[PDB]
Amino acid sequence: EWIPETLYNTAISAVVDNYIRSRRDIRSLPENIQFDVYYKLYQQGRLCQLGSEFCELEVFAKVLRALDKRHLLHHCFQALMDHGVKVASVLAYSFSRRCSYIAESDAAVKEKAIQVGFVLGGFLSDAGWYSDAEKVFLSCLQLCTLHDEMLHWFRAVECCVRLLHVRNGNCKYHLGEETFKLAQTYMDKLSKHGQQANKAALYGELCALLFAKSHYDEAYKWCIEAMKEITAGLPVKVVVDVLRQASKACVVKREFKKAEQLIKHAVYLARDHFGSKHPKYSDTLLDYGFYLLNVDNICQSVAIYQAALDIRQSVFGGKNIHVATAHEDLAYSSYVHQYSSGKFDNALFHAERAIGIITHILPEDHLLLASSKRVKALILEEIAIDCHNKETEQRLLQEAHDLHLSSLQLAKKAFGEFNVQTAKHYGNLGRLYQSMRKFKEAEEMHIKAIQIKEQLLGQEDYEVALSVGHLASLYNYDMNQYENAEKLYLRSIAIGKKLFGEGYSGLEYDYRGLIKLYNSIGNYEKVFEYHNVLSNWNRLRDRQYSVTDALEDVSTSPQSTEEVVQSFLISQ
């Protein structure tokens, strides 16, 4: 049809083509034009001409004020960070230096600086530069402490809840508790003055922290405390964050009824206010995929992660920690989905991208690698198990050995010896030892993992069942301890049917293990008595394979706000 372009776009291209001469006068343009000139420079591939201006705090602060095109700004900023210029570090350093300069000034300039820091640090935390967003938020918090007035006391809690968010994604859990204690200090002294501050966001940050720290028992308490504080006047971002964090915390407590409603309402709110191509909606999709991946819904969990990754691959196109998180979450889901098939080429490609990004942007001694290099290792052994070459199997098993031991060291240094994630790595090492024909210490690994899983999480739990299933498979296949695998298999199936019924995916594996166990100790009357149960499981999975896609499962307007929260609260 050849529709002529507007005079705005025509003049945008003309000003960009004469950018060098008129770079000073562009900085005096209105806010909406300046972003369009800068986004045109990005579109023209002139990142190095554009990066000369985004490194200035004043210019970027005016660019941040255009909230309509923040989806374009995130992609542009990620292109600059991949371009080789460290814009995020430069902006944080400039903001901290300027705050240290204007600390000894009046309250109006400090209000303006705190607003600039709020928008900039929120952008960097949304972009994934948590290490470069603490500095901005620490500068804002420092600005809040010089004067002890009402507004500074009110905004110190905001700086301490945004500072807590950039310390859970950065895995500074040791500083998170100190930040939260400081947050209670300001919140309590604000409550002394007859003005309570809403605690939904802060308690949701504790929920995320203690779930990441794997203090599930206290994470549930704090998500209860968070959702007791959800009102109607809250921003939608805070409500969505609390709902998705409480959904993540309800899964690990093995209460899979309220978490469905919580994550459904969170996904609906994310897709309503923000849209289907927003990073917050991608975060909700990741938590929803976590839910589906946990309770047997693998076929849609892999689909939601692909939807979540596609959002972050466009808003954050390039080497970003959010794209890396989406990759490492999808790779594990594709690991589970393709586990039965045994073909891992997309899953390994997505697991390598996750490590290929984190090792580029984060230090090699950082905790997010532990969740990444583990996942690839789970693939590397399963490729080694499902390949015929002995040399290739040995090399990939040694590679998985290195990744598992490094991940275990990261988890042990960060959390400690007695924690859930350390037990996860112990169980993975046990499976790997069973794969590398070293059955002597695979048993040691399995009981070491179980004695930590059943202690913290209770004797009957999902991961306890998974670990005792691995132990039983180790016993009854090659170790030939047939008198011990039976009780472990019974424990596995008893825990599995306790929560997931007879539709659990691991029932096929433990039933085949039972067949192998009973094919060598007599009791041949029970081999077919479990083979027909295996056939029943197979037909149950055949009938349950056809479920509606999880993207439209939330549909449009399933529930309303202040209703799912109340149902969750009264269901206790």
Binding site: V336, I385, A423, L466, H470, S473, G506, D510
Partner: peptide, 7 residues
């Protein structure tokens, strides 16, 4: 095969 999925 021979085991379940990794934790």
């Amino acid at each position: 095969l021979t085991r379940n999925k990794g934790p």
